[PDB]
Structures are given as C-alpha cells and as structure tokens.
Amino acid sequence: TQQPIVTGTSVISMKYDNGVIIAADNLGSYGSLLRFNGVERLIPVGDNTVVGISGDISDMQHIERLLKDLVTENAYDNPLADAEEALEPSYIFEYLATVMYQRRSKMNPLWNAIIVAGVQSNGDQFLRYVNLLGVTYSSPTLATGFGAHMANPLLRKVVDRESDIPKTTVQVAEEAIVNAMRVLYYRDARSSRNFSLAIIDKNTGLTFKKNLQVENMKWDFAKDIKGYGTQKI
Amino acid sequence: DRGVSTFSPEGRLFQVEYSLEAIKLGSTAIGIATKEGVVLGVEKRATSPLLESDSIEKIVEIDRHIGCAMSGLTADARSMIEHARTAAVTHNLYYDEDINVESLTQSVCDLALRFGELMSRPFGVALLIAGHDADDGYQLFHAEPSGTFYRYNAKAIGSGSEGAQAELLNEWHSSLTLKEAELLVLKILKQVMEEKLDENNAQLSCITKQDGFKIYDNEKTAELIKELKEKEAAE
Amino acid sequence: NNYDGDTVTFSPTGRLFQVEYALEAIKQGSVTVGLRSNTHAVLVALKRNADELSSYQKKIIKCDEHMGLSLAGLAPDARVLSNYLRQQCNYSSLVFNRKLAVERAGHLLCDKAQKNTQSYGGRPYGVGLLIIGYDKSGAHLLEFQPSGNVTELYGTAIGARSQGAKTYLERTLDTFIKIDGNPDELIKAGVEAISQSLRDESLTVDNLSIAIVGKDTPFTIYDGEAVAKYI
Amino acid sequence: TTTLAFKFQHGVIAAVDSRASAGSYISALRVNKVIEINPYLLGTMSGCAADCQYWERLLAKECRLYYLRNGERISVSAASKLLSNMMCQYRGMGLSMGSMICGWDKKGPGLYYVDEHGTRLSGNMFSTGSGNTYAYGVLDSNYKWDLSVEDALYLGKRSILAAAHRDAYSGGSVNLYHVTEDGWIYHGNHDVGELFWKVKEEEGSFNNVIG
Amino acid sequence: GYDRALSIFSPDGHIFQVEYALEAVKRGTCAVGVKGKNCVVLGCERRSTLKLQDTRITPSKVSKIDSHVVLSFSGLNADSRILIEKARVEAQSHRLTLEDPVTVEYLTRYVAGVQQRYTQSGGVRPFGVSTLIAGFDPRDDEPKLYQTEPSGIYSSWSAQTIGRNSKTVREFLEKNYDRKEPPATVEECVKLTVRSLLEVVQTGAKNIEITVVKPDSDIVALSSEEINQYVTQIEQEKQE
Amino acid sequence: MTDRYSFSLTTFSPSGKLGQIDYALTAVKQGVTSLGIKATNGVVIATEKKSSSPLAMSETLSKVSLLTPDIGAVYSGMGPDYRVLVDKSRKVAHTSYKRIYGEYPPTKLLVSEVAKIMQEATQSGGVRPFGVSLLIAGHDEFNGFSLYQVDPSGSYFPWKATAIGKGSVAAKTFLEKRWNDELELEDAIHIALLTLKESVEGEFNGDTIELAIIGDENPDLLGYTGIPTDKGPRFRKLTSQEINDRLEAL
Amino acid sequence: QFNPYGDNGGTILGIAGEDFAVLAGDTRNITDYSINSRYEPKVFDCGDNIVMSANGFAADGDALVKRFKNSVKWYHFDHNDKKLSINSAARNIQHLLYSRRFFPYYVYNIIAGLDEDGKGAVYSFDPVGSYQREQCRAGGAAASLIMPFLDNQVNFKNQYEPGTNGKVKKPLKYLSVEEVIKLVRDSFTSATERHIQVGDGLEILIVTKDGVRKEFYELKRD
Amino acid sequence: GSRRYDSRTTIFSPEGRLYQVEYALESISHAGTAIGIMASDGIVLAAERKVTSTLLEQDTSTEKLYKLNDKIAVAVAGLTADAEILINTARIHAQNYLKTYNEDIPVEILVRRLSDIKQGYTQHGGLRPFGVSFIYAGYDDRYGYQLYTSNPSGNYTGWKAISVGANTSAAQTLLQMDYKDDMKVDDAIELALKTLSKTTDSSALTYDRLEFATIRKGANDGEVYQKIFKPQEIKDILVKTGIT
C-alpha cells in the first residue's frame, strides 16, 4: 500500500476506420503544484503500439522500463523479431494486465490507469484499458481519470457503437480528440496546455506528434462577467 | 562408488534394472481381465507354519473401484498404496467422481523415478493395479519401478512369472467369464507354487462394477479350489 | 571407462559418456518419424508392446492445440519434458495471450536438458523427442536430443532402425515439402517413410500411431481403427 | 438457520431448515444443510455456507481414508474430533461453522456438537443456528428416550417448524433424517408453507395465526 | 545436509545394508513371544557375560509402549530406544487425535513403517533391530502378537522367536505349539515360553526374563524366584 | 555448487587412530620451537621469528598475539591456521563471555572455547583439523597465573612450563632441570632465553626472537586515567631493546 | 488506504430447462456513475459444453474464468481427454474459490450446461465457494429484482388453479427454450428500467446437446 | 563429485557390526583405566591419568573426572576433547530438566539422553562417532546410588562395579572377585585403588597419576556430597590403604 506522489492526469483515446488514436498531456503534478512541464506519458512499443499511462509517474517510469526490457527479451533468439514474431498490442497489454493484477493481489499496486492502443497483424484495431486494481475493459472510446467523465461523452458522439467505426475517418477522429483535450484544459485543474498525440494506422503506420498545444480557446466572454450576483461594476 | 542415477553403457539405469531382480524373487501375483470383471490372485508364501497366514496382506483395496496386488519387497508398497489411496480420494474431493484407473496408475508411477542424491533408491516392488471406470471399462495395469506401466488382458509377476505368462498366453480369450477367470488364476498359481495350493496359502480377489473390489473369504476360495480339482479330473 | 561414473566428468578426448549412454537409450527405443510441408506437419510412430496380452505403449503426446511431440527412449522422461512444454506453452498463453513459437519451445527444452548435464547428482534425460507444430511462421518440425541439441528440420526419424526412414525422406525431400493442403497424402508419405525401418513386423491397426497439425487443424492423435485407412 | 439432532431409543433424528440469507435478502429457498459423509455418518450445517461445505466434505475425505487403512468404519467420536482439530488450525482466522456429527457405531448411536472454536461436546440433544432457541422449547417439553420412530421424526419436524415461523432467518423447507444401525434414512423435503397449515389444522396449534 | 544413498540395490537384486542389519539382529540376545487362549507372554534372554550388573536400573528388555501394548526386541540396543520412543509418541498422538488407544496392529504398522523409511532415505542406515509387539486391543479379549524386521515387513504370529539361536527355539515351538488348542491358562503359556528358552539359554538363573500381558491393560513382569520355580518343575519332569 | 562435503574427513582407522589428527601433530612437530614458563608472579611465552626472506619485515608478522588484556598466545605449526584461530579466539572472548558478564573470561575458559573450535574441525563435515599447537598464557583474579597447551585434537593441559614444535623433547628436558615453584618472573625470562637459544641456528637477538609476558598491570598501557579499578593490561610484548638487554646478562 | 476491491456492476441470469440451459448477462461495465464499456462480454464458453459467468469485481471474475478454463485444459491432459461433467466442474470451482477463503474472489458465479443424463443444469456459487445445483438463479446488481419474478413465472409460486381458491396449486409444467428466452428478455428489460448499472446490451448463451449458441439483444443505453 | 572421498561412517559390516563404533572402542581401550564402584552408603570413582610429566600442573588439571551437577559425576575414557562436547550438553540437559520440573534430573534420564546423542552419530549425519566411554556415578531419590556406563554405540547399562578404558578384562575379573553387596564406601575406595594398582601399565601407582572422587550421603543429614579429591588428599588415601 502506498499513495501516489507525482501524478499524470487524463489519457484519452478512440478507434477510427483504419486504426486508433491516443493522446495525453505533458504534465507531472505534485499535488496542486504543477511541478514538471516536460513529461511524456505516451510510450511507443515498436511501430504498432502506443501505451498511454496516467497516475503515479515513478510507477509509470518503472512500467516504461518493463516495456523497454520486453522488446529486448522478445528479440532474443528470434529471427522474426521485426516481422511475424514481433510484439503485438494484445501481447503487450496482457503482460501489463497480468502484472497489474498480481501487484494488487500482493497489496502493493502500481498506482496507474493504462490504455494500450495499437493495430494487430491482421489489421484489426486494438484498444483496451487496465488499472491498479487489474480491472480490464475495451470500448470504441476509452479514457482515464477526468477524461472518462468529460472526453468519453464527446468521443461517443462520433463513435457511439461498433458500427460507427468504419464510418469515422482519421481527420474526424483527430479533430474530436484535439477538441476533447481543449475541454479538459478548460475544466481539469491538473492539466496542461501542452500535449502529445499518437496515431497508429494500419496503412500509414505510427505517427507520433510532440509539442502540440491547445488552441482556438474561448475566453473573451469573461470580460462581461462581473461579481457573483448583484454587482454591476 | 558410483551415482544412484547412473546410466549403463547399454542405456539403462543400473538401479532400476537391479530392482527388477528383487521383484523376480518375490511371491507370485496374477491378474486376469474379463468383460465381467478383473480377478487378482496371489501366493502368500508363509515362512513358517506358526505365522498366521491371514495377516499376510498382499492384495489391497485402493478405492471401491480399484484394487491392487503386489510382488517383491512388499514393505516398499505401503507408501505407494498410501499415495494411491490419497490420490484416488483427493480426486473425488476435487472433481466429485471416481478417478480413472489409468490416471491412478500414472500417479503411482510418477513416484517411481523420484530417487537420487526425494528417496534414496527405486521401489523394489511391482504392482498389478486392477479396476473399472465408465470410460474404458475393466482394466488391468502393471506398474514397475522404472516409471513405466503397461495395460494387460492378463499378467503374472513374481518368481513364477514367465512360466505363468506363457500359460496365460494360451488360456486367455476375449469371452472369458468371471468364474472361468477365477479357476484360471487358481490353476496357474497351483502350477507355479512350491507348496501345495489351498485356501490358507493363496488368496483370490476381484473387482466388478456392481459390488466393487472384494477380497474372497477362505471358505469361498476353498470351494473354487474343490471345483478346480474336480474339473481337472473330469478329463 | 574411468570417466563415465557421472555427468560432471569430461573424458580425456572431451567426451561426456553419461550423455552418450543416455543417447544410447534412444537407439533402443521404437522408431518414430517426423515430416512437414508448408501447410501441415505430421508425426508417425511405431508403438511397441510387451507381449500379446499387453497394450502398445503410447508414443505421441499433445502439448497444446498447436503443438505436440513423439518420444523414443525412457517414457517417464518424455512425460517430465512434455509436462514442462505444456506449462511453457500455457505460461505464454496466460501471460502474453500468445501461442508459444515452436523455435522458442526448442530453445527451452535445450536449456532444461543442459542443466542436467553440467551438475553433480542429477542425470541426463534418457529420451529423444520429435516436436511438430504450427505457429505464426507456418509449419515446423524439431528434433530434440538429451545432450541439449535441438535441430529444426523438414523431416527426420529417431529410434531403432531410424536410418532407413531418414534416407527415404532425404530422397523424397522435394516431393513431400510440396504436399500443401492435402493432409492424407502427407501422412501417406510419413507411413511410407516409417515402413523403411520395419523388419519382420508390419503396420497393424493397434501398432500404428499418427498425429497431425496444420493451418486449420488442431494437434490431433489417431489410434486404433482411425489409422486403418492408412494401413 | 435452525438445525437440530437428538439421540433416542431407535437411533438419532436429524432435522434442518433450508433457508439462506444475504442480510435481509433471502438468497436461497432450498439449500441442503446436511451432508452425507458416509452411509452411517451425517453432518448438519450452520454458519458460513462455504466453511460448512468445504470442511465437512474434507472431513468425508479423511473418514474415507480411515476406512481404507484400518479396514473398519470410523467412530462418531473419532470423526467429530478430526473435524474439531481442523478448526483449531484456523483458530482465530475467522471461520464460522456450527455442526452436529450424527451417526451409529459400535457404542450405539452417537451425537457430537462441533464449532469454529474447536469445541467438541457429546450429548443426547443439540440445536444450532439463529433459530435454535425456538427448537429447544418444543424439544425439551416433548423429548423422551421412549419415543417411537414415527413420533421422533415428527418431533424434530415440528421443532424446525416452530423456529421457521418465529425466526426471520429460518424457513423455506424441512429436511428429515433418521440414523439407524443399518445406516441413515432420508425422510423427505417438507415445504414449511404447506406444512404450517397442515400442522395448524391437525394439531390445533398456532391458534394466534389466521388460516 | 548429508544425502548419501547408503541403502541401495546390488546387481543380484539385494539391498545389502538391510541384510547386514538382519545380521545385527542375529547377534542380539534371543527374544520369544507366545500367545495363549487369554494371554500373551514375552520371554527374553539375558547374556550372563555381564555380571556385577545392577538389575534394578539396567534397561529392561521388554518395554511398555502404552498401558495395553508392549514391545521386546533383538539387535542393537541403542537403535531400539529410537523405535520405542517414536512408538510411544505415536501411541499418545493417536489417543489425542482419534480418542482411542492404538490397536496392536496399527502400532506394529507404524513401527514397521519407520523401519522401512530408513531403508530408502538418504544419509541414514537401517535399524539393526527386529521387534516383537504384543498386547490386547481396547475392549477385545483376543490376543495379538506381531513381528517386525529392518526391511519393514511385518506379520502376525501364533508364536515367534527372534535373535541368536532363534532357529533352534522356533524349531521347538513348531513341534510343541498346537494351534487347535493353545496354552489355555497363564501357567501353561509361561511354562511353554520358559521351556523354549531353556533350549538355548544356558543357566535358568537370571538369564530368563518373562513378562505376562493379559487383557484390559493387565501387564506384570515375573520375578527371579517365580521363574526359578518353572525352571525347577520343567527339569524334574525331564528326569524320566 | 553448495558444500557437498557434509561428511567427516577425519575417521577412526582399524587400529583406533584418528589419522588426520596424528598428521596434524606431525605438521606441528616440523614447526618452529615455541615455549612457555610459569613463575610465581607471572608467565612468559617465547618463540623464534623465522623470517622467510631478509627483504621481509619480520616485525609485521606477529607470532605472539594478545587475545585479551590479560591473556596471550603463541604457536607452533602452520601460521595461517594460527592467525584465524586468534581472530576467532578474540571474538569468542567477547560474544560468549564479555557481552554476557561484562568482564573478560578467565584463562581456562577461553582455552576451553578455543579447544572446542579445534575439536569441531576434527569432527565436522568437509574440513581438516587445525595444523597448530597453541600455548596460551594468562591471568585472572580467582585462578591467578596459568599456562595451557592446546592440541589439534582439541585436548588441552595446564603446564608449569613446556615447549612445542621442532626441539620440544630437548627443551622440555632443559626446563625440568631449571624449573621450581619459587621462580620470579625475571628468572623465568632468563630461563626462557637460555632454553630458546638451544633450538635456534642463526642470529639470536631481539630482532629474531619474539617474547611476551603476563605479569603486573600496566597502567601506562591503558590509554586513559580516572577509573581506579581499571589498572591496565597484564599482557606485555617485550621490545627488541628489552630482549637484548637481558642477553648481555645471559 | 489502498482498496483492492471494486464494483463493475452487471447482472447475470441462469435458467435450466428440461433438455437445455441458458446463461444470460448484460454487456455493461461500470465504475461508480461512469460507463466503461457498453459491450464487454461477461458470459463465456469454457469448453466441454459448459458456460460460465463471474459477476461482481471484473478483475477477480476474469481471473476465475481464466483459471477454470485452464482447469478444463489440464483435466483433458491428465485424464485422457475425458469430458468434464457439469457436476465435476462445479466441485472444481468450489476449490478454486476457497483457495482464497481469506482474500476472496468478489464474484457471484454461475455455470450452466447439461448433466450426464442430458437434462439441463445450472449451478450457483457464493464468493467463498459454497455451491449447489439450481433450476433458476439471478446474480449480481439486480438479482433481488429478478429472482422473485422467476419464483413466480418459472416455479409458479403463490399461483393456484382458479375455482379451487388456494386448495390446488398450479402444476409445474416444463418450459421451452422459446418461453425461457422470453422470460430472460423481460427480466433484463425490467431490470434495465429500475437499475442504473444494468443496460446497453443483453448476451444470452444457450446450451443443448448440439452445442453452444449465442443470441444478442439491445438494451436501453441511459 | 564429493562422493569419491566419503568414508561412509554410518554403515554395517557384512557381519552386522558398525565399523566406526568398533574402531572407536579400539581407541578407548588404549585410554587410561577408569573404575566405578557402588556401595550401600555411596559411590567411588577412580581413574588413571595417562603418562604424565613432572612439569604438568596437576592441582588445576582435569582430564578424567567431571561434574555434571551436584548429584551426578562422570569418569572419562577416550578423547578428552570429544568428552567435553558431550559433558557440556549433559550439563545443559540437567539444567533444562531442573527448570522445567523444578526437580533434579534422575540419573538414568540424563544417561539415556547422552547415549541417544551418541546413537545418532552411528545412524545418520555421516560424521564420525564420539571416541568416548563414560562411567556415570550419581544419586536420586528413586533408585538411590547408581552406576552407569555408555560407549560410542550409544548403548548404556547399569552396574554395581565397572571399569572402562585399558585393561578392563583384567580389572573386571578383580572387581568380580572381591566385590560384595553389603560393601561400604571406605572398603570400595580400597578396592578401586587396589584394582588400579594391579592393572596399571606404569611401574608404580602414585598420587600424581590419579584422579579420584566419591559421592557420599556422608553429608550432614539426608543429602548428598560430591568430593573431587585434591592431589594431597589422593596422596593420603594411598598411604592409608597401604599402596605407597
């Protein structure tokens, strides 16, 4: 049993017709203090998977090393390490899911919520969630922390059920993700303007975008708002 | 000296091969499998007339549907029987059902090669494991100290084994009744035994689906001996 | 001679005699054949009986839905090693949701057998194994020796008189490799291969044991009247 | 639950109700609170359902093994003690199990009370569960050693009914058992709803209730 | 720990260490067991090479395992103490877990199991001891007499002897003991036990120990004078 | 790996001999001579500093060792075995005594502990006996001065005076003629130097001889003042100069 | 303080027919007032004509199913490909659950299939391993809403034959698979209305001698 | 591996003897003779030190006679170092019994314990046995005065008079001849010394070559006193009995 110290907030994601998108801001909070402003919380594994992590950052860094070690270990005595016997999103997820549930069963959890986003060998989209309790679930849209409350409602308007996935283009999906990130910046007190976004497409491969900013923000209407009820000036 | 788990130049484990020699010195045990049941019979071989022969327990119940006969260093069998009984009942606990005869035999044979430098030497006893289950019916297995087990329609182990096995070769057919099998075990036991066969120095047993595993009374066996004598005198 | 008392001792020419004696146990064992195409992999095994009243000792063991082996030598050692493979195949599935690669299965068997050849007190395994399987890189066939050496092959055979079947496969190499999408013809080639190792005895209904795995075929074993088709 | 068991002239009676609770919610109307350990041994159940089932089915494993080794049926005294010894290993761990071990052996009929604390009591009559106080009232006023099997079966049946009525966490149905030297005999499943009205009319009891 | 396999098979299928343990038993002083109709008697030889002995405190040959079971032996004396101690512990352990005293058959089976374990365990040698275990089961008037040996085999006997010159006294018992009519009384049973030892013992003085076990935990050891009266009567009948 | 020698390497032979102990005693016989003499008001222990090379600094190699402030030791036989015994003896004096009773052990009991360690090397698995004989001199309040010999077997005997190693047979004879129950410490040192000269071949001076005494309390060697009951160690190693001074009156 | 348990909601329902059995469950997965997934399968085909569902804390439920599926696999290996009977599976699960008597699988488990006589069978468990064969059982969040309805409409409880006035009960006529599925769908439609954790979708697994069949039905998504 | 160098200390010979036990007994037969004699009013322990020197400090020396507690003592024959290991174990066992039951340990119970330890080294562990034979002289309120002996086999027996070590065959004959049941301590003292005087391999028996002890109820009223004789006291009893 512990308590999380340096923390990372929402990770959001969704499926689209040819792949999956995932995003997460670059902040490492120390309680209410916005301590670290250059933290990467999306961690690619090969060219077919991106693992997005929220929660305790020390535990994130530990997981990041487990994944790095996993790639090394898979290459051992494996001539097809960059081909048929490469690491799949489903392999990477199940490994993490096994670890997360084992750690909670020893009453010493990794204090995180993880989303593994990727594309399988056969071109199928992979998107699944796991957390400190070892709880797992999959959905066309997935989000952690505040994202679950604010992002999912917006992303579910684009892909409400399974049959909406082939009807969703990458431009529409990215637009929806970027808008969700803006909404979270308005409303999440432990979020930052700067974020990273990753697209894993079955055709164009892994596109990893860094140093993105929330833009087109509405603040002008604030000038008119005065007092808390009766005040006019 | 030399390792206990050493291979000979011929590719055999010395200790396993030597334990087989101890089994050849053991008293004769015979098993015959039929569609009406499996019969198990043994030579008691008391070392003195003062020894109360009914205390010689070379036929043993493992479960209600599985019996066992032994030959060789019979003291070694006690822990094997204990494990067998535990395995049989433990499976009944975990799965609410009778355990398969083969699965029971396999569990016993897993102990066999657990020796080295675990126990210090192989077992010096061979077992005939007879039983019944719903999947494969009436079965007879021969469990060795090598860890190997063969299924048999009929089998003899102990000192008079190769003489008895040749006899079982000729006599066994797929349409044998239980009564016929009983007399056949008695016939072959009487043939290979040193002393004259009677109800006190030989013991019969069987396993049927209905009644399960039963050791025969000395009064019941005595009648089967008398029935044998008369039918041999009939031609 | 003086250097065969245990596995921890090299001879003056750099030989390990206990390992070589364990290799000898395989040569005494009954013949078994392995061969594959690009779509399927096949095991064919000649089972051995104690006498006419006895059953025919089983030679083929299933390890997973996509993998299994045939044995030649000490059967209990095959049970120990096949049990280990079952666990490793199972660990791969439960943890990584991944079917264990046949090549990696061989590497694991090699390393398990090796530890028994370098340590005092223990002994080498006294059995040879032919592992077939179908994974993400297609059909495979492996030959395991208790020295630790594991070899990926198109076809092979181990046991008594196995040299005859091995020569046949070496001639037929170009033919049987091309038998794609036809399980019955691949088995025929295996049955014809193992037939080159027979003397006096012939293939009967309770004598022959066959196994197959392939693209859309789980590892299944055929015994009894199921192999009468191929006699 | 309510369970009872008592010795008498022609063996021992065992009766239990059939309810299972999850707080206020009745989770099961018809559970079996008696385990047939062997043809001559019974075990009642009260407390944690899982504990009762696991440990008494494990007792039956150990009782079977006794027969195989000794070639003789286990006594009720020995069986009850094996169970109590199991409880003493998990002493303080939080097990909840109250049971009667009923049977017939060489000393005649035998009845032992065993609970989670490792307690082991020999006696002629016992009753366990949330509704035992109600069962004892009927039993104590009507029990004799000189009972007929027919009357004894009814007494235990009626004693459970008493408890099923008043106790909120007892009811559903009644299961009867009669243990003899030729083994135990099951005397059926009796719905309390139907039994109540039947007993009320025939016996004249429960005048307070309107039917 | 010391794991060395001392008891192993030889090419001819023998475990020599177990067989050499039987030679230690052959060296041991003679012990005899005879069961009558309502009793069992245990006779034991005391070698008279050791005089100036304090017979009050010297370990007696017959040992009580419980109030209703006794154990005598032949072979290594030190080894016998280890078996007796284990047996006595098991006797109390059985009473504690099952609430009945051990049967003579069960106690024998346990002691024989211990002896067997020491023939296939690493680092240990077999017990150089054979035992005679006698008594009456709880609430049973049928006499019980069992024998064990280093290999771990055990069996029930109407009458049996072990130790040095046991071949001779077994010869005597085989012709003198009738199964159809066993020693009806205590006297007849003791007389036959003393007679059998007189075939081997030497002097009938302090060389013979007798212990009578009757049903319901009635165990007594005879004194020198009581035994001496049997010795006197036997030889006076023999002079004819 | 693992230490698989869990069995005794010292065993009884048909004749009743414990071979390894005998052979250890043979190694002691080959070793350089050392001796011990007990006086009325002290004990002296002495030996030859047999230097392996003249380039070697023999002052760094200490054959005579302090075990406790009132107990000293010297040996004959294998030096490395002696060195580790001194380390163990120093430690056991603390663990099994001083940390319990708050004082240093008496000579006889420390000897008893050293003896026990040497006995266990004679019976325990996978080890050979120690190839040394020790002479332990010491003082304690209730037993006074004492001198003990300890052998590879673990046996120990108290002596008025004795010698071990190379020329022990001759040296013990020399001591029998000179020893009496009225000797002062200086007289015992004088006899020690005379006895030791017979077994030495080459140079005989303060730099080639190692000699220590158990005598009067040395408050100058205590290192602190203020506690009346603490009067300093009775063990003192004689200097090179102090030896040479007594070699002129020889 | 760390709390190793959680509640993922959901509700399951098993009904045993004369020669068939059904195991139904909603596809909604939740924490607190949020929805995780609208379609997350909860009822699984475990092999040997057995279906299983571990309702409650999803992580513990997924672990138990995973372990039982594994137990079926090793049963085949160890006992010559023998078919695991439904009664044997039940007893095996009891021991899986009790292995954690002091750190329980927080799940209400139900399995369904056919007994060795070919008749329909349902077995119901508590979190610590107590089980029993049942005809009708609802488990999970809306268990208390559904069970009374099944007592009434499956076992005809409190129902009597008109004209007799409480003297003669309604006879216990057997139900067809079509009739059962109607009662299942109505049960989940009613449960969806009055329970916030139930909704999104309904997945039913039907077991007969011919095998395991699936049926899916939409539920209200609010 | 290591097996090559294993002597196998705990095995039977073809004749059914324990090699190492027999060879340990051979060792003990060369040790100094120790004698124990039990009388009605006490027990005597006499023992011969092995070829001593004039420079040996006798008054502070102890190789033969050891105190286990106030009621029980032992005479040693064999390896002294081995004996001290066992003696310290016995001293502890006596104190454990006293702490547990608040009564002094009965003599036999202590003897059995030590003998069981010796037995263990002959059956398991692969170690050499202890090359020691003890004579136990003790008193308790059950059996009164008691003499026991134990040897490396772990076998123990009770005695009226007994010898261990060298020349036991000769010594036992001499004791068997002159010993009587109604004997007293002063007479037993004389017998013990006379026996050693005749069996000794030395030219003459002197005070410096002896260890001597008595266990007497010759303590003021109902209680028992152990007396380990001093060198001067051994010299006086030698003159008294007329040996020097």
Ligand SMILES: *[C@@]([C])([C][O])[C@](*)(=O)[C]([C][C]1[C][C][C][C][C]1)[N]C(=O)[C]([C]C1=[C][N]C2=C1[C]=[C][C]=[C]2)[N]C(=O)[C]([C])[N]C(=O)C1=C([C])C2=C([C]1)[C]=[C][C]=[C]2
């Ligand atoms: C009375 C009804 C007690 O209220 C009786 O004592 C029964 C005993 C009976 C033993 C044999 C198995 C069935 C129970 N006790 C219970 O029913 C207990 C009461 C209880 C004790 N401690 C505790 C209890 C309830 C809740 C928390 C703690 N009830 C249970 O153990 C509950 C958990 N059992 C179930 O819910 C069961 C279900 C749903 C079920 C069971 C048990 C068995 C088979 C199928 C389903």
Ligand SMILES: [Mg+2]
């Ligand atoms: Mg809603």
